[PDB]
Amino acid sequence: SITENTSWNKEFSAEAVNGVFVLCKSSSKSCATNDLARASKEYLPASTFKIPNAIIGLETGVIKNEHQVFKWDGKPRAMKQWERDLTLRGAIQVSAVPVFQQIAREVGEVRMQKYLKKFSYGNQNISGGIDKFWLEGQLRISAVNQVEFLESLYLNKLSASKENQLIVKEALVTEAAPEYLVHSKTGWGMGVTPQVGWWVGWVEKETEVYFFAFNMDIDNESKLPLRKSIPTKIMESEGIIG
Template structure:
């Protein structure tokens, strides 16, 4: 593996006062560029970045027939008020609706979920015994480097899933403010509220090439949480990708 440390990105992390890693995988050249290679290889709970493979497995197994199938949120109180209604995956992934994606996981079921993870070669591929919590609480974990490999294959349509499912998931993670940017956030928030991890992952398409990226940071306060996307975008801009 060819890794290149980038001093500009390290300086951005230092200035932001956050501890974390950022890696970009130039898929065509198979070169990784970023900050903190050691941390980039450490696996963490993926949290809502798992909505990407969850969507893929849901479509591939027929748990939903399309990203426009409306799924129920289940009623009751929700962590965010915008989650408190039924919605399709197309909308649910944009507002990161946890109850809707828990329902999707239950419809997929454990056997099909485990098979999907194996086919995707996603992180440690561990689901434990709770079908609708393993990506939020563990035991599922994935590293920033593994995220970029998975996302690079998704971007190129090279995952062993139906082409229509791959295309649909690429479409719903495409960013409205930049048609060349595909991305998803995540926030691992254990019950004890310690050791929280924030993610921003995705890829950029530029001049026919794919640049898959993954950022994760220790969330110690609201400022660290808010830094994820701006820090990631600044790193991509410094590399001439945004």
């Protein structure tokens, strides 16, 4: 299933990054990683949790459909970018925390618990408060588990309607090129130490698909772009992006 490639550490070393990339062609049955140990280590998901949360919001009817607008009430928010009305896609792409905290409260503990068991999502630990377990609570998931989850979503194999999986997939499109299409999601777990940065998703190029998950320790905000640039450089050297 999974082969170690220590040459990739070259990409990590200039910037002194502690991190892991997991990359799979076609299925999670043929993966490579730079670090087998860290590939299976579980970290706080932070905003990557918007993926299952959005699917569960749709499945339970908490989110009406892909056209639902989440209105800003006028109360100040942690980020300038969140202080506007947002569509589902917008809320996911600008990683609007308070929109998803309200979704989580309306889903509720009992249903949230069940859905993470159906999705086999990490340690499935949602203690710490219904509106903050993926931000500062006990939930943890590995890069390998992120790839397995995303593969299921890609194939419409999660326990959820095909419709709701498709809706969330469109919301995850981040790069459209004539040769290839990227679905992806960032995360930055600030409420854990060391802080974790994520980039997870998949790339379709020609008739093939590649699933990936990247995470790294982030001390300082100036290192955030490395969570996309390190794995993009690896994917581009293999011809997956470009």
